[PDB]
Design a protein around this ligand. Sequence first.
Ligand code: 07D
Ligand SMILES: CCc1c(C)c2cc3nc(cc4[nH]c(c(CCC(=O)OC/C=C(\C)CC/C=C(\C)CC/C=C(\C)CCC=C(C)C)c4C)c4c5nc(cc1[nH]2)C(C)=C5C(=O)[C@@H]4C(=O)OC)C(C)=C3C(C)=O
Ligand SMILES: COC(C)(C)C\C=C/C(C)=C/C=C/C(C)=C/C=C/C(C)=C/C=C\C=C(C)\C=C\C=C(C)\C=C\C=C(C)\C=C\CC(C)(C)OC
Ligand SMILES: CCCCCCCCCCCCO[C@@H]1O[C@H](CO)[C@@H](O[C@H]2O[C@H](CO)[C@@H](O)[C@H](O)[C@H]2O)[C@H](O)[C@H]1O
Ligand SMILES: CCCCCCCCCCCCO[C@@H]1O[C@H](CO)[C@@H](O[C@H]2O[C@H](CO)[C@@H](O)[C@H](O)[C@H]2O)[C@H](O)[C@H]1O
Ligand SMILES: CCCCCCCCCCCCO[C@@H]1O[C@H](CO)[C@@H](O[C@H]2O[C@H](CO)[C@@H](O)[C@H](O)[C@H]2O)[C@H](O)[C@H]1O
Ligand SMILES: CCCCCCCCCCCCO[C@@H]1O[C@H](CO)[C@@H](O[C@H]2O[C@H](CO)[C@@H](O)[C@H](O)[C@H]2O)[C@H](O)[C@H]1O
Ligand SMILES: [Fe+3]
Lengths: 304, 47, 47, 47, 47, 47, 47, 47, 275, 256, 45, 44, 45, 45, 45
Amino acid sequence: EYQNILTGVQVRTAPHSAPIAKGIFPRLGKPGFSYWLGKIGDAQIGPIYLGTTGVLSLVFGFFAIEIIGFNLLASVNWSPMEFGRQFFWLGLEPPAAEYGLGFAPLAEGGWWQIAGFFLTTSILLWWVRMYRRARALKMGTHTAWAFASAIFLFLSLGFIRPLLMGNFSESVPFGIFPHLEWTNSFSLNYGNFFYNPFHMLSIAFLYGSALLFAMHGATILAVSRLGGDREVEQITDRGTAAERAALFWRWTMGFNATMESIHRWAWWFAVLCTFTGAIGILLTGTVVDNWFEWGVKHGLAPAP
Amino acid sequence: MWRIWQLFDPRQALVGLATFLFVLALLIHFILLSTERFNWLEGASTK
Amino acid sequence: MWRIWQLFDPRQALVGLATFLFVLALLIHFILLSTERFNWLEGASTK
Amino acid sequence: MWRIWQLFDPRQALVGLATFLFVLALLIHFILLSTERFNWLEGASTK
Amino acid sequence: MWRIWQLFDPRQALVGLATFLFVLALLIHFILLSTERFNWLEGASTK
Amino acid sequence: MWRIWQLFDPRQALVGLATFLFVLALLIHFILLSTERFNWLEGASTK
Amino acid sequence: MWRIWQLFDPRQALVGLATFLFVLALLIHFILLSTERFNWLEGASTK
Amino acid sequence: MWRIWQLFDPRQALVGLATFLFVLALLIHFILLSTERFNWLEGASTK
Amino acid sequence: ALLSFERKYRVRGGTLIGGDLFDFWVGPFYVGFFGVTTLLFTVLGTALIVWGAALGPSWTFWQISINPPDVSYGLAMAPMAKGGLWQIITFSAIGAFVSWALREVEICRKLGIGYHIPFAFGFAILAYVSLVVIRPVMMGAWGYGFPYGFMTHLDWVSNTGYQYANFHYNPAHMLGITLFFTTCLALALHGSLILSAANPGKGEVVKGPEHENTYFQDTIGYSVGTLGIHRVGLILALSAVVWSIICMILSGPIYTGSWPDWWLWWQKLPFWNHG
Amino acid sequence: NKGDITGYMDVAQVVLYAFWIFFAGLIIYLRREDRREGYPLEDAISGKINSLQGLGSVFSIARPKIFKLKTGATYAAPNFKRDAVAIKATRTAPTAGAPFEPTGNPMTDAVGPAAYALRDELPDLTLGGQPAIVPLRVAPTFSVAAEDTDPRGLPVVDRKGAVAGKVTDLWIDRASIAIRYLEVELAATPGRKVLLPFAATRINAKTKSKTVTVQSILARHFANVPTIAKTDSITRREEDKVMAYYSSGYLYSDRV
Amino acid sequence: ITEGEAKEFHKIFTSSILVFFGVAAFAHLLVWIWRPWVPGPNGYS
Amino acid sequence: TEGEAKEFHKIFTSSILVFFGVAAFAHLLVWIWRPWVPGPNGYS
Amino acid sequence: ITEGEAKEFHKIFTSSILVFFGVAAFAHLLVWIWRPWVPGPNGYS
Amino acid sequence: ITEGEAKEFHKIFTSSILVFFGVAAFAHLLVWIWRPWVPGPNGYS
Amino acid sequence: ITEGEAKEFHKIFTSSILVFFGVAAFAHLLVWIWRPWVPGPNGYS
Ligand code: 07D
Ligand SMILES: CCc1c(C)c2cc3nc(cc4[nH]c(c(CCC(=O)OC/C=C(\C)CC/C=C(\C)CC/C=C(\C)CCC=C(C)C)c4C)c4c5nc(cc1[nH]2)C(C)=C5C(=O)[C@@H]4C(=O)OC)C(C)=C3C(C)=O
Ligand SMILES: COC(C)(C)C\C=C/C(C)=C/C=C/C(C)=C/C=C/C(C)=C/C=C\C=C(C)\C=C\C=C(C)\C=C\C=C(C)\C=C\CC(C)(C)OC
Ligand SMILES: CCCCCCCCCCCCO[C@@H]1O[C@H](CO)[C@@H](O[C@H]2O[C@H](CO)[C@@H](O)[C@H](O)[C@H]2O)[C@H](O)[C@H]1O
Ligand SMILES: CCCCCCCCCCCCO[C@@H]1O[C@H](CO)[C@@H](O[C@H]2O[C@H](CO)[C@@H](O)[C@H](O)[C@H]2O)[C@H](O)[C@H]1O
Ligand SMILES: CCCCCCCCCCCCO[C@@H]1O[C@H](CO)[C@@H](O[C@H]2O[C@H](CO)[C@@H](O)[C@H](O)[C@H]2O)[C@H](O)[C@H]1O
Ligand SMILES: CCCCCCCCCCCCO[C@@H]1O[C@H](CO)[C@@H](O[C@H]2O[C@H](CO)[C@@H](O)[C@H](O)[C@H]2O)[C@H](O)[C@H]1O
Ligand SMILES: [Fe+3]
């Protein structure tokens, strides 16, 4: 009874990759092989492409990470021991309300603003990198727009809502426990963030993404004895694996997808999980002061 | 010196140099903006 | 300095330059708006 | 010493050295900016 | 005590040793900085 | 200057510029609606 | 200006134009509804 | 007792011994630094 | 009423229970014995939910709630008016879920495919059972299950989360959140890669597995593979559910205190317990 | 008050209803994409184009999108190429919902779990325009990685333990580096050679000896495995046929 | 693109950009007449 | 190619200069409106 | 890439080194005239 | 790679060492003259 | 690796050990002259 959960016998060949124009930068990384990764998936590692947008994104991101880490280490007076003790509790806090959207003093949130700007720039440059890498390989840019949804949520959390409130004071800090505490206090300040309906939609789409990527993973693993793992080939030439995958769900559920359209569902659930989340974040504080009172007004709560 | 370009590709050298200089200059301007003395827009008094 | 285009590609260089110039213009405008002295939309009194 | 550079490729060695020195210099500047005495952007006083 | 290099190739050995030494030196400098007695940047009276 | 359309396809250039101009116009209009002086819907007094 | 349809498919362009105009009109209507002066359902006083 | 070296090649054996001993030394030094009596840097009095 | 390829696999057999009695289709659905049983449990549970809505004061779909019995009843069966209806709906839901999974097993046998899908659904059934049976039994009362209501089960989630004063600090909860977020990210990447390979643009012939591998080799530095991605995704979702179950068993049955100050153990390890 | 639009309606509710409209449209779009294979629906008995469908039919089926291949080939989705109503089976009851009795040996008649899609007779292509599924003999560069049992020469047995045959060659996918097939020479017929999918094997590297076992079909069933033509490059239809035959074992491996 | 159609597109694109800039300039002049957006030394009013 | 680089540079420099001239005119006008280098007593 | 390709690039590169360094030095001298950034013993004046 | 083709690399490398360490020491001397970084028994006051 | 090259590398590596350890020892001597790091029975005083 085999399951295609682990690859008992592996194959290793001469590393090769799809052809790209040389460009200013070559492929970098001297590809190698790994055993556990080949047990769970492919064994080859790299090479990683590092173009102009890749260099720009890496430099901006590294600057942001170094600024954040330097501030975290400085907050505990440069003690490696006490840095270890408080690492989770350490955080680069955003500037206070009084400074508006302008530059705060470095100790009072200027470093947070500089780090956030550099991180935003690196994330956007990484988005451009995904777009350009997809276009270079003569492929579509679905990954870029799926990423753009996540960037929308990130910018709504960090920049857009501060713009609307005219204030970075309620932005999320750069810390492990501090950003969870920001989540908790954001929910408390605005009345039981469960009563945010776009939060409910985002949770529905997150649950649906997990559900869908368990359903689809189990379906492809169930038809992997029939060439079902080779999804694009079953999309261009429908084999019996795709037919049985469709008929299983048609018989158990009443309807079914295509090998191509199931990944459209997969794309859209993931994208909507963050799109509705960004909308719900942009709506709180600006339009809806208290989500519990909005729910009471609109029939979500028994009106105490 | 004259053969520094025999080890580094001039395109890669120029791109890396421009990226690093741009990011460093942006950082320096941001840091000066975050000061009571060198924020040329807020224009706080020296004294 | 005419050989700068013998290294890089005119089309990609132009789109990159336009995007960078627009983003820098947006950043400078937003920074100016965030300041009290140079916010031309809000009522800005010098004194 | 005319035979010790056959241990490392000079390109990667120079790039790594430059990155490492820049990170260390940035860190030292940051530590100075944190300390009151050597923060040159602010007007802290010795006495 | 010279026969070590028959096993440990100097290339990766030197890189690892240099990285370890730099990390150790940085760790000790940070620990010294934290302590109120040996912080040479902040400055504090011994007596 | 007609040769720029040698490098860029009229159709993609047209759609990209159309979306850019519309998004910029929306952004400027929303900024104006955000300012007290230039919100033509609330119509706040100039005084 | 009749050659624009040699670049843009009349069916696709017309559908996109219709949808864009409908969303723009809907947004403008809801914006006017949000304002006090131009909300025609409550009908608040001008004074 | 020399028979160890035909099961454990000295390369891996010595690199593992080095990592283990260095980690243990760091551990013991840090544990001492956490105690008041043996923190040679803070130097709290014996009494 | 059949797909272009459906009237070729509609053979009999593959049923665990029932023989040829219920081995048939109604419309698109396959029924089987376990389809009959899932109808039995679903109709009864939904009718009981609507009956509890009638006994309730709202009919507002989001304010309809079936509450479990008060904790003063312990693990005892409760009167139907006050607590018992929730218990019967719980048992009916468990029976319907099990019937659903078993019907999926019969469909898998009939189509000759692996049983991965019912096995994966077993984890969702286990999460529900841990929330309404296992945890309330360990805690000693049926009133620790969640109410069957749209917004009231969210009130239960919030109340139980703040019972430990910050439920984020539950480390198993942190790990489950990490797995859920990583599952969503991996699903986005996988759907995006498949769509981009199948729909590469104007011209742009359909790309092969090598192009898909090359994309993530260039962008990330590693590519899992068109078979291994479904593996890692199923494992990600199932592990997220497993660690959520673990974090809810840990809260109440095992740990009955503030999760935030559980982490003081970390603060006081001997190599930085400065005291 | 602050966020309202008309008395009871506020901005958040309007954005919510806008999302609901968008999600209804998105569900329609996704269902249109779903209805790109096996559509339109046929009658369960007669096979005429019929189904209980409403005013959404005009929007139910999308125009055929065109997939371009790196050979000049093209796929149309949906292509309304359907299966024949008359299959090698008979209705248990004439009620349009009843299952089918096979009218023969369903292993070799491609009925039920043995049924295979009627694909095209072309091997999968690599980036270089060559077959992807190839035996290791004609791929000198490819090799089996170490730290794994080499499945060459190991006895191929069923669940009952009878040695069905012996493995001689491995067939692998060039596009994705993994073993696809094991070439098995029959202990009963040397002149016969079969392909057994790698997904249907247990490694069995942990036992008294090393062997390859199959849990689906019995030893005698290896005498009727579908054959292939080129013996060094296999078409999609041939591989789909072989996989369907092997997958049919679990349902009826002991007669019908 | 073909130089012959490139010349025509450039000509009528230039005309269209002139039209758009002119209409926008008229709009800006009207807004400035209504309410200028460059404050004086003592604010606006 | 590199032959077209001559004409590309010929037009690219003219675009650079015209864009810089418009930007410099804008900066001069803004400086008249409100200079951005404060004096020892801040802004006045 | 060659010994010849490198010569013109090095010439133009060092020309740009000098131009950039001169412009930056003049800008720094201007900023120092405006507000010096090395404080005295009693801090900034 | 080739010893003959790398000795001049070492000459350039040591010249760069000389210049970089000279600039660094010059900078450190100016920083020391501005404000020393070794506190005495009384600290810095 | 040929034992002669290993011997030469060991010799130069021992020279580097000598210079590095001497520099570190001088550094520690200077630091101890500045501030010792072994507290007395009654602490630091
Ligand atoms: C007490 C807390 C309170 C409580 C009531 C409660 C409970 C629950 N909630 Mg919630 N939540 C509350 C508050 C609250 N909640 C959210 C969000 C969500 C979404 C996130 C989706 C996602 O993927 O995010 C995650 C995606 C992001 C943040 C966007 C993409 C991120 C990117 C590209 C980052 C790139 C990073 C790098 C390149 C790395 C380098 C950078 C550095 C080192 C710095 C999701 C659906 C979700 C789930 C649930 C569940 C299941 C529950 C249960 C069971 O109780 N919550 C966010 C949101 O969208 O809200 C509308 C948001 O902002 C916010 C707030 C304030
Ligand atoms: C549908 C919604 C879905 C939700 C649930 C979801 C959530 C979260 N997604 C999260 C993180 C990331 N998401 C990503 C990438 C961006 C990388 C970046 O910005 O780099 C740019 C940053 C940086 C450069 C800064 C640091 C750099 C470091 C640490 C290295 C520093 C050292 C250096 C450079 C020197 C050494 C090395 C050398 C080579 C010299 C990261 C890993 C991406 C995508 N999300 C998508 C979608 C989703 N993301 C899609 C479709 C994606 C992409 O396409 C893209 C990608 O690359 O995916 C592989 C997080 C933290 C999430 C949570 C839960 O909070
Ligand atoms: C490589 O690193 C070594 C040294 C080992 C270690 C270095 C660093 C370390 C250890 C870093 C650790 C970092 C940690 C723990 C980070 C935790 C980060 C988390 C959890 C972040 C989570 C959320 C934060 C978000 C979403 C913040 C978003 C902020 C944004 C988008 C802000 C944008 C702000 C802008 C654009 C500001 C504009 C204003 C001005 C005018 C200033 O812009 C110019
Ligand atoms: C100003 C505030 C901070 C924000 C940062 C602004 C500068 C960084 C973003 C600028 C815009 C980048 O936009 C992008 O630029 C790079 C060059 O840099 C170009 O891309 C270039 O590098 C890619 C890397 O894959 C290569 O294929 C090739 O050398 C070239 O195409 C893209 O054609 C352009 O789309
Ligand atoms: C083409 C479409 C887009 C067009 C965009 C171009 C818009 C340009 C707008 C600014 C042009 C300069 O506009 C000029 O600014 C100066 C300040 O320097 C103003 O200044 C003058 O009026 C203000 C009005 O309060 C007085 O307080 C001030 O003392 C006086 O100097 C002038 O009233 C104005 O005529
Ligand atoms: C591509 C764009 C390039 C932009 C280049 C910008 C160059 C800047 C030129 C600065 C010219 C200095 O001009 C001089 O500066 C001093 C400060 O040193 C300022 O000093 C003056 O203004 C300040 C603040 O308004 C007041 O205290 C007082 O009115 C007076 O001291 C004045 O502005 C001017 O007397
Ligand atoms: C070329 C691109 C890179 C640019 C690099 C530029 C580096 C410039 C370094 C400047 C160093 C100046 O060094 C500094 O000189 C000035 C005199 O001019 C001295 O003067 C300083 O202290 C005195 C005493 O209170 C103050 O009155 C004075 O305002 C202050 O500047 C400092 O004691 C000395 O430290
Ligand atoms: Fe898939």
